[PDB]
Structure formats: C-alpha cells, structure tokens
Amino acid sequence: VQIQIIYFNLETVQVTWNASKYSRTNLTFHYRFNGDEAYDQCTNYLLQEGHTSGCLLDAEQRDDILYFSIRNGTHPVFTASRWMVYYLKPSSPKHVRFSWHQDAVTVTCSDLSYGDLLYEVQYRSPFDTEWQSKQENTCNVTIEGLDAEKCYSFWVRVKAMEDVYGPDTYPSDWSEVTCWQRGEIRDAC
Amino acid sequence: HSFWCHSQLEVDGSQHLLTCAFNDSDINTANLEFQICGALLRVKCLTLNKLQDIYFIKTSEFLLIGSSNICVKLGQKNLTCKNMAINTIVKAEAPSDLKVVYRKEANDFLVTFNAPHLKKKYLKKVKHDVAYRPARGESNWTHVSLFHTRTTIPQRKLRPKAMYEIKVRSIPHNDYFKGFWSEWSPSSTFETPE
Amino acid sequence: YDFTNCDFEKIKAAYLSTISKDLITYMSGTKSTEFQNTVSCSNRPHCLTEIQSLTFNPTAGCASLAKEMFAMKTKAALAIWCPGYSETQINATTTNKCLEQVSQLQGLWRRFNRPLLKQQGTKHHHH
Numbered sequence: 239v240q241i242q243i244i245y246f247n248l249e250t251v252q253v254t255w256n257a258s259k260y261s262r263t264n265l266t267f268h269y270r271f272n273g274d275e276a277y278d279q280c281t282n283y284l285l286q287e288g289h290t291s292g293c294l295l296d297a298e299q300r301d302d303i304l305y306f307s308i309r310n311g312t313h314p315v316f317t318a319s320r321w322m323v324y325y326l327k328p329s330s331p332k333h334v335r336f337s338w339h340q341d342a343v344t345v346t347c348s349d350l351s352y353g354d355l356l357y358e359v360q361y362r363s364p365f366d367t368e369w370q371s372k373q374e375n376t377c378n379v380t381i382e383g384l385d386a387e388k389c390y391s392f393w394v395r396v397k398a399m400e401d402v403y404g405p406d407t408y409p410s411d412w413s414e415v416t417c418w419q420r421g422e423i424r425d426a427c
Numbered sequence: 428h429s430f431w432c433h434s435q436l437e438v439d440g441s442q443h444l445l446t447c448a449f450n451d452s453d454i455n456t457a458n459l460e461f462q463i464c465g466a467l468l469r470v471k472c473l474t475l476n477k478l479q480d481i482y483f484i485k486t487s488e489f490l491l492i493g494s495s496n497i498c499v500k501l502g503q504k505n506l507t508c509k510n511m512a513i514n515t516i517v518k519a520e521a522p523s524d525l526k527v528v529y530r531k532e533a534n535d536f537l538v539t540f541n542a543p544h545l546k547k548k549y550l551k552k553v554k555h556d557v558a559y560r561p562a563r564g565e566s567n568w569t570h571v572s573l574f575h576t577r578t579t580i581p582q583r584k585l586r587p588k589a590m591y592e593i594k595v596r597s598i599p600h601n602d603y604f605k606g607f608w609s610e611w612s613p614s615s616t617f618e619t620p621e
Numbered sequence: 622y623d624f625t626n627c628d629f630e631k632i633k634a635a636y637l638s639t640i641s642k643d644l645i646t647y648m649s650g651t652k653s654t655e656f657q658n659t660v661s662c663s664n665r666p667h668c669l670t671e672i673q674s675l676t677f678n679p680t681a682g683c684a685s686l687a688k689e690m691f692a693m694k695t696k697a698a699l700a701i702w703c704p705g706y707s708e709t710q711i712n713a714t715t716t717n718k719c720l721e722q723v724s725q726l727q728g729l730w731r732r733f734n735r736p737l738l739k740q741q742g743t744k745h746h747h748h
C-alpha cells in the first residue's frame with residue numbers, strides 16, 4: 239500500500255492510497271485524533287476507476303496526530319499515525335505587489351494566518367544561468383543591487399520552516415511570473 | 428592582563444575552537460594559563476593550550492548554552508576572570524575560492540565565493556562583505572553587503588582598462604550566535620575591458 | 622516540575638540554534654516516515670513536560686538518552702531558563718527503541734514551536 243498525505247493550507251487533510259492487490263474492492267478508511275480513542279469512518283471518499291482511492295477530512299486549522307487505518311473490510315491493510323502539519327502545503331502567495339527604487343525592489347504579499355513560514359522570491363535576467371533567491375519570515379522581501387537597465391523575471395512562493403513543521407512539507411505553488419525593466423511591467427523577457 | 432577570546436564552530440569535526448590572547452602583546456606570558464569553567468558537558472573546566480603568543484582549545488565539551496568563566500591564572504591564583512558565552516564570541520570563518528568572471532553579454536562581472544558556514548550544523552546565516560578597488564594606487568574600497576555567495580559588478584561602475592583587487596569577509600547574523608568579522612579572504616585580481 | 626515559569630522564547634532560541642540540529646544528527650539515516658508518531662502535547666508548558674519526560678525519565682529499551690548531547694543541552698536550557706528547575710533535580714543515577722523515542726521528541730519540540738495552532742483540546746470562550 240502506497241500512501242500520500244497533504245494538509246492543504248491547514249484546511250483539508252487528504253490521504254490517498256493505491257494497492258493493485260485490492261483492485262477488485264473498496265478499501266475503507268478509518269481515523270481519529272489524539273486521545274479520541276474510537277475510530278470513525280471516512281464520510282468523504284475520493285474514487286478512481288469506480289473504487290476508493292482517498293479520503294478528505296475537514297481539519298479546520300487543527301495541529302494534531304491523525305491516526306488512521308485502511309481496511310479490506312475488517313482486516314487492516316495499512317496502519318499509520320502522523321502529525322498532520324508534517325504534510326502541510328501552504329497556499330500560493332496572493333496580492334503580490336512590486337515597488338522599485340533605483341537598483342532595488344520590494345516584493346510584498348498577503349501573509350498567511352499561521353506562522354513559521356518562509357516567503358521566497360526567485361528572480362533572474364536572461365544573463366543568469368539559474369534562478370537567484372531571497373526569502374523572509376513575512377511577505378516583504380527587498381532585493382537590492384539589481385540593474386534597472388535589465389529585464390528580470392520574478393515569482394513568489396510560501397514554504398513551511400523545517401525546524402517547526404519538519405522535512406516532508408510541500409512548498410506552495412509559485413505565483414504568476416512577472417517581467418520588469420526600468421521599474422515598469424513587461425510582456426516577454 | 429586584559430584579554431580577548433573568540434570561538435569558531437565545527438572546525439575539524441563536531442569539535443569547536445576557542446582562542447584567547449592578551450591585548451598587550453608585549454607581555455611576559457611566563458607561567459600564565461587560561462582556564463574555562465562552566466557551560467561544559469562532561470567536565471567542570473578545561474585548560475587552554477599555549478602556542479607562541481596565543482591560547483586555544485579544540486573540544487566537543489561546549490554546551491553552547493549558558494556562560495563560562497574564562498580565567499587568567501598564575502598557579503592557583505586568578506589574575507583576571509571574565510564571564511562570557513561561547514555562543515556570543517563566534518568569529519566567522521573567512522570565505523574562500525573567490526572568482527570573478529567578465530560577462531561581455533551582460534556588461535558586468537560575476538563574483539562568486541565559497542561560504543564555509545553553509546556546510547556547518549549550526550550558524551547557517553552569515554552576512555558577507557565584498558570589498559574592491561583598483562590594484563594600483565590608493566583608493567577607498569567600495570563595499571557590497573550580501574547574504575548569498577554571488578554578486579555582480581556592472582561594467583559602468585568600474586574604470587576601463589584597469590586592474591582591480593577584490594576580497595571578502597563574513598560575520599554571524601543569527602539571533603543566537605553572535606560574534607566577530609572573519610579575517611579577509613585572500614585577495615583576487617581581475618582586469619577590466621575597453 | 623511546573624514548566625509555566627520558563628523563558629519560552631529563550632528555550633525556543635536554543636532549540637532552533639543547536640538542539641534541533643543535534644536531534645537530526647542522532648536520527649541520521651532513519652526515514653522521517655519510519656517511526657509512527659504517538660506522543661502529543663498542547664501548550665508550551667505541556668510540551669516541556671512531555672520533553673522532560675521523554676528525554677530524562679528512564680523507559681524500557683532506552684535506558685539512557687540523558688548522556689546524549691541533545692539531552693545535555695535540553696537539561697542546560699531548562700536549568701538556565703526555568704526557575705527552580707535545578708532546585709527540583711533528582712540527585713542520583715543506539716537501540717531501535719531509542720531512535721523511536723527520539724523521533725517522538727522531535728515532534729514535541731516542533732509542536733512547542735506551534736503553540737498558536739488549535740487542537741481537539743477545546744472549549745475556551747470568555748467575557
């Protein structure tokens with residue numbers, strides 16, 4: 239049994255599975271949170287090719303250990319217990335704004351309602367071989383020492399801090415790519 | 428007998444280095460020893476090893492949490508004792524492998540170097556200071572403050588058909604580990620085009 | 622001991638600087654997903670209570686984590702920043718079970734850094 243867990247923006251927990259042996263069946267998903275001793279069954283199932291393939295739990299911003307089991311009826315096929323935030327995927331940066339000053343730029347965006355996140359800005363000119371990066375605790379990243387005369391491509395994302403959330407989280411998806419030369423927006427680069 | 432100390436982390440292993448010396452180098456250090464007590468894992472105290480005019484200890488005993496008393500002793504007599512925390516006297520290691528590549532296409536110079544702290548377990552945030560000036564004659568150095576191991580120098584900022592000298596240093600920037608500027612890296616040189 | 626008189630921000634600084642790194646060094650080579658997470662905590666005083674227990678109270682299989690560098694630093698941080706912690710100290714004295722237990726510690730320390738996140742431990746409205 240191969241499993242995937244995603245805690246979308248501290249809102250929804252999605253546990254998905256795949257198991258070729260149990261293809262001719264609907265495996266059932268049973269869960270509970272710490273202390274709440276009796277298991278409850280999934281009330282929101284994901285299906286694939288007509289059979290159960292995942293579960294959606296409304297987690298409502300809660301930081302707990304989710305204890306779960308997938309069963310071939312009564313017989314448990316897979317059992318695990320994980321801190322849900324370890325599988326956190328923050329949402330994509332919203333309301334991204336750029337303010338230029340000579341050879342510098344300050345990128346701001348809407349901060350999330352939860353802490354210990356890194357708001358990362360990546361950028362490059364056609365002369366750069368790879369993306370350069372600057373990140374901060376809040377969505378107010380200032381990148382000094384650029385060239386007003388060059389075109390720069392930019393994009394932002396939110397990461398969870400490994401010291402707080404652990405190593406297996408997902409970065410958010412990157413926000414829309416924007417191009418800038420001489421403090422004005424552009425089409426291509 | 429006033430003195431200074433600096434620590435350096437994860438030097439030749441998981442081991443840390445503590446270095447102390449007198450402010451007055453014209454001092455007869457005959458029979459004067461440095462002892463550090465407190466904030467150690469398995470022992471109460473350690474005695475530093477003398478090498479010419481400096482004292483040092485390479486050890487894994489430092490807890491890196493809390494203050495230690497560093498004493499200048501003559502026999503069992505304490506001449507002067509200072510309380511300090513190993514985590515607040517960190518001297519960053521100097522960057523290395525400084526390289527400059529002229530990019531005609533970009534009309535600039537790409538400066539790169541290696542930051543040793545990035546390979547360490549603790550202290551993974553340092554501030555860099557890149558300094559450059561023409562290799563011939565006297566000039567006030569131009570300084571660039573960076574948090575990464577690369578920067579560019581636009582062609583227009585430099586004099587044409589000239590040789591430049593460039594060097595870099597680092598300092599801890601961390602909310603826990605505090606300390607001192609590293610020594611400067613060895614200097615590299617480059618030539619500017621027409 | 623009551624961990625409500627601790628300087629949490631100072632303890633948090635110590636965790637992020639070195640202790641976190643020492644736990645990672647101890648766990649080196651094990652799959653993150655390899656140990657099931659079983660020990661939970663709520664608020665900072667409760668997390669320090671559970672960290673206290675797992676790091677220093679001797680269990681079966683893992684007799685002693687107390688000599689480990691991460692434990693010695695944890696003892697150091699609590700003696701400095703929790704008043705009356707050293708005045709309550711009891712004055713006498715790698716297994717596949719120790720790695721399990723240290724995995725549990727990593728989770729509690731991480732939860733200690735998320736005190737504002739809500740849990741099943743609810744019902745607290747007021748006037």
Ligand SMILES: *[C@@H]1O[C@H](CO)[C@@H](O)[C@H](O)[C@H]1NC(C)=O
Pocket residue numbers: 240241242254255256
């Ligand atoms: C589904 O199984 C394939 C391998 O057969 C794997 O690539 C995929 O990631 C599994 N799905 C999940 C949810 O991990």
Ligand SMILES: *[C@@H]1O[C@H](CO)[C@@H](O)[C@H](O)[C@H]1NC(C)=O
Pocket residue numbers: 262263264283285288289290
């Ligand atoms: C599996 O469940 C789906 C509905 O969720 C249903 O259409 C299908 O008949 C079930 N399969 C079995 C094996 O009963």
Ligand SMILES: *[C@@H]1O[C@H](CO)[C@@H](O)[C@H](O)[C@H]1NC(C)=O
Pocket residue numbers: 707708709710711712
């Ligand atoms: C342990 O020893 C020290 C010194 O004897 C003392 O301050 C401490 O309170 C002792 N612990 C208890 C519980 O008495």
